[model samples]
Target: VFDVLEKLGGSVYKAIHKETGQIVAIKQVPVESDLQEIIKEISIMQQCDSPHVVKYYGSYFKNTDLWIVMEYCGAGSVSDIIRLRNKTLTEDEIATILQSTLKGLEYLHFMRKIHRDIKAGNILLNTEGHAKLADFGVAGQLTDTMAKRNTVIGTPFWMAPEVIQEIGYNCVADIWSLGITAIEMAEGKPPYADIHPMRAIFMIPTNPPPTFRKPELWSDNFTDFVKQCLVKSPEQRATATQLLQHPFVRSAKGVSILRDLINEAM
Candidate 1:
């Protein structure tokens, strides 16, 4: 029922449905050369159905271009919101966002899926202040919950130590990225943001887990939560469900608390 309203970029567009006047976002990727990958992305998205995950409408094709229609997130990404604020987010605000994202991760992990990338840029928000996990370009699926994967992929700064070392990893790696994202939200940028990408790759595995740029500014509960996630040993890291029980997450105000921040960012 949706029709193209405007072209947003190389493979994205603003769309609207004629019958219900419903607005949506559509992605049109030329996949003549890589049809299988696009199909995989669509299949994975179709299988995902959670309040914290982006809603997928359906997919179609025109010639060699694959079109993916999805829910429209009006407030853009968390990274955009942070950038607009031009300062570190408050602990309560970060807690709210992280709680939502952890819920999304809990669902994905329960389904035996791993969101390889879990940075702020991949966390999106709608106008109503609901946060949802997006971007599945590198997401992986396992045959079982305890299965381990060794794929060396993800943004370097947020990559887990095990992931960077090319050692086997599992769903716990996402927790590591979540911790890095916590730092990102609290500090206005990811750890090692000042370093070059290549250097970060070397430093991530060799260096210890990062702490806040200004540790005294945040609460112990918040820092402790990040520490738990950034644990060098994947086995020692807390699962998404366990993280949901953390005091920092338990204290989260609600998605509605983010409305003002989104409105201000927009």
Candidate 2:
């Protein structure tokens, strides 16, 4: 499979069926990779049947290269949109993204899966602006097996407090990342962009905390919602499900207006 999409640790590509016009995203991994880790990811993804999650078509082994087939995200990732806009986005567009992202997270949490890596780049949107949660590489099955994981994982800027501490971390960590993502959307920049990654990690745990200052761009409710997500204490934070119930997301009627705007732009 030719790599059409590349992320830090993974790459995705479009592959067509030789006989049919069927198109799919083939994810390739190195042969020297751990089989158990690969199997774990496949198992978790296979269990998930939500429309918000990328559908696992199948897998194939081409000698050393391991290929995983998945649904193609037509609009690509929210990160792609942000970058193309030169690190800025409208509040209405951010709302749509948050609405879909929380829905996807709700589905994952319902299945008792923790998406260890939650970032704008991982949230892929379709042509219709529908969002889908992609990338299960760092995800772990919430099990009776292990409680406290030791390894430090996740993007630094979007990471949670506990994740930065390298202590016992869980799904709540995802909530923290979601908060950072919300602020990033409103501010049109990732949190702590000025500081180095290592320094940001160290400072975030002890520092006062950074707030997104886009008062002109976002509504009071939307700004408050972002603050709620960015709370330093994990216990004080809102879950994806809870965030879905927030007025901002619950404003389904408002979404109609957004649909019109999208159509107009199209």
Candidate 3:
């Protein structure tokens, strides 16, 4: 099918199912690329059925590409939302996004998968203010690999300190990245954004955990929530279920509040 709707990003496109009239997203991966990785993600996503997770429709081989079909998220990603809006997101808005993402992580982890990559860009939003996690390329691909060896797993700016170390990883690293995303939602960018990847990787393990660049502007409870996520020890980091119980997350408004922001962005 033609990629006629809109360019989602890179090789991805917004498309529709002609037979059922369902709008969908299509990721076109060249058949020349490694199928092993593609197969892994397709399988992982196929088994993931949750409101917080992007719905996978199906995938198939075309002439020279493997077309990956998925649910269409009209509002784009949380990162896209931040870029579109002028004002930074409210702490409550950040909490709502984080809370939704935490649910996604909760389900993924419950299935014995680790989402090492957790950033606003991977958090897709729909017009209804529903937030879902995307990108399974490397999430469930790891079998018995160490975090350091999996350096290509995530962006350095949001990497966990334990992930920087040459140690094994768990679901906790995802929490750290989500914390950075929280800062991103509030500050409109993650910490060390100005730094290069090499520099960030070098400093992540040595530097103290990052919090809001403008701490005084936010409340203590929200600050505490980020602190809990960015703990130096991965074991001390808050789990998704634990984070759901946090006071900040508990006060988060409904998904419709996100719809208000989506309207503003539009």
Candidate 4:
């Protein structure tokens, strides 16, 4: 048996397992609402088996609400934590996040999956300071290692120019969004966040790649990292495997450091 701890959203709930004393997040969506997408999310979650990615337990249904039981991230989403702290994060902290997220991406890419929506909001952390990629509602599964996707999806500010243009894109597109996420971590918002979403979408495909407003405030390595991620050409962009070897990610401190930062936010 389980007791509801709180309502997470329209159809999600935080619950406690009475028998085992385990905490879990339970998403209860109506059976008729985007059934295919919901099933796709479950299938993708089942295929994912990485420490840097959220764990999926199982699923069932009671009446109209299909229930998805999964791990409970006590620290909540990175975006929420950043917002709580007024949208600020240290470079070291960001590096830690990037490293973990990249590990998750590497695993997904290896499995021929593309996390179309890669942003601070989809990165969740637990009390132990471990981060995991979450929210796969918009994720895509490629046919093979070299498969390309042309779907125009993802958040406006973090989406890649190639994606915005509806040109065929692949896993590297995630790197572009990861770069935007890096900017969000440092500056507290994505590029063109101040502009209208539709306007920002138009600007991304036509304008030059985004850069730090004050490069002097950030390290050259960090700046270069963002630049590599924001590369307009998918062919020229760093893949997840290549980025794992980058200095910014390679030199990152242990995940334990995030505990203090998470504590500060809480």
Best by TM-score: 4
Which TM-score value belongs to model 3? 0.91
Report the C-alpha lDDT of model 4 over 1-266, residue by residue, as the tens digit: 77888786637788998989999999888887777766777789899889999889988778977888998888888899988877588889999989999999999999988899999999999888888999887898889454888899998999998988967888888999999999998988898998999989999988999998778899888988898888898898999888888898899999888978889877
Which tens-of-lDDT digit does each residue in 156-222 have in candidate 1? Answer: 8899999888678888899999999999988888999998988988988878889998888989999
Best by lDDT: 4
Worst 10 residues of 1 by lDDT: 32-41
lDDT of 2 by residue, 137-223 (tens): 778666677665546777788877777786776676777788788777666667788889988888788875567664676687777
TM-score: the better of candidates 1 and 3: 1
Per-residue C-alpha lDDT of model 3 across residues 193-266, encoded as one tens digit per residue: 99788888889899888977877999999999989988988777778999899999988889877777899886
Between candidates 1 and 2, the one scoring higher on lDDT is 1
Show where candidate 4 strays beyond 4 Å: 144-146
Any residue pairs clashing in model 2, and if so which?
none
For model 3, give the 10-residue run with minimal summed lDDT. Answer: 141-150
Backbone atom clashes (below 3 Å) for every candidate = 0, 0, 0, 0
The candidate with the higher TM-score, 1 or 4, is 4
